[PDB]
């Protein structure tokens, strides 16, 4: 019946650029096997808070990691910040520290890591997010699973963006996904 | 109480330009903290019935807004018709049409009501239908929260397309999303 | 509370042109009203295995029928293996093999029959997805709700190849979507 989120205010808690130049509102469900994902971004600072590409071509893409380890805790070196991710509990998060996060993961068999037995792998979650709310103003976030190392699990977000932005400003839509439980 | 449906009967319970031309099949079911949920839509009669742009070639969009109170009950002046909402029990409406819907609304401190702070983009649910079933036929559903006036929640369903079509009958194919929990 | 799903083991239970010359990864959960499915495919043999649409000129789409009964319990003349295919309860799989108990199928007044209406639109619930995980090879996975005869419930996974393409194997990437249960 649980659900673990990272608090939904406007107050930044994610570092892309540099420090805490962005708030992500991720809110993850689990069902059984099934877990249901909502994701959102708005970036408050720094070089990816506005595209002005006639000036800056080259910024057409970046990524976002969500690494955990054994028992699924999210490490301090991902792009997040673990002061605001906590099992909820009304709107307050009951300020500590958790656990027990074993099963929360894209699963190893169905996601497994890319170990040397080569198989091409089907992980990939494609979608889509358009910036300001505009249509004219589509955005590509890549999720992928288990393809990070040191980690155990993974959860990766491959932005791309082909398009000639000028003083477009980073705040997303929100966009809805599953992935299969490792328990 | 695991749904707040409306009876998938395909009977017009929905006016968009005429008294009860439309179905509209959105269905609603409580994850906690979201909100996963399905929409379909038929127009059955009145000017969105069948589309011929090269005749009326200014009519490419409409809206379905729900407005609920303080306690989550669908207010009348609603697209949608109240005697047609409530949670499911078998396949009628647990015999009523209930008045605690709170814990099945947007969020407000995820999707805030109108201020003078900054509206973010992620109030929107940006996702694509296809009219009839051919792939050929996309027009755009753009789902909104807490944007209306004179409401304490809402839901605003907004059609959009882009094609040129000569008579086409408005069914459109389900679609699914979710949405963050005020409780 | 239950998800019925395919041990994800790569492990080919699903015929398309020759026997089990593909892997169906279909994962369902009683989201209570609704079902969140979650699907994938891999062609490991065949001529659908590796496509190339310089030699054979026509791009042939296909399809995976998913039959059940007045009971749910997938019929064999079905395309997937009926042995894969049961409720993990943590990925085990307890040896029991009663099951007449399921509201884990399409509602026939939501989606009805073919023959006994009129059928409109929202029979179909329209996905696409990326062969390779490459932006430039996408591909098409339409999914019908019990429109199929000979049965009392049938999901079937219509695909389609859209452009010409050239020395690419079939591995289509992950996609999340839901209906609305019988019971």
């Not at 989120?5 to 540099?18: K, L, M």
């Not at 805490?20 to 070089?47: E, P």
């Not at 074993?102 to 699963?107: A, D, E, L, S």
């Not at 709310?133 to 699973?145: E, L, N, R, S, Y």
Request: hydrophobic share 30%.
């Amino acid at each position: 019946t649980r659900t673990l989120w990272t608090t939904p205010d406007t107050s930044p808690n994610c570092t892309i650029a540099q420090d805490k130049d962005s708030k992500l509102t991720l809110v993850l469900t689990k069902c059984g096997s099934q877990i249901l994902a909502n994701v959102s971004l708005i970036v408050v600072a720094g070089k990816y808070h506005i595209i002005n590409n006639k000036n800056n071509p080259e910024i057409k893409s970046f990524t976002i990691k969500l690494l955990f380890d054994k028992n699924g805790v999210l490490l301090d070196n991902s792009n997040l910040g673990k002061t605001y991710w906590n099992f909820r509990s009304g709107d307050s998060n009951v300020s500590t520290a958790y656990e027990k996060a074993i099963g929360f993961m894209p699963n190893l068999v169905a996601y497994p890591k890319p170990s040397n037995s080569k198989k091409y792998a089907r992980d990939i979650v494609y979608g889509t997010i358009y910036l300001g709310g505009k249509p004219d103003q589509p955005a590509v976030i890549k999720t992928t699973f288990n393809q990070e190392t040191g980690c155990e699990y993974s959860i990766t977000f491959d932005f791309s963006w082909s398009k000639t932005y000028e003083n477009v400003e980073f705040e997303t839509t929100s966009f809805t996904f599953s992935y299969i439980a490792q328990q």
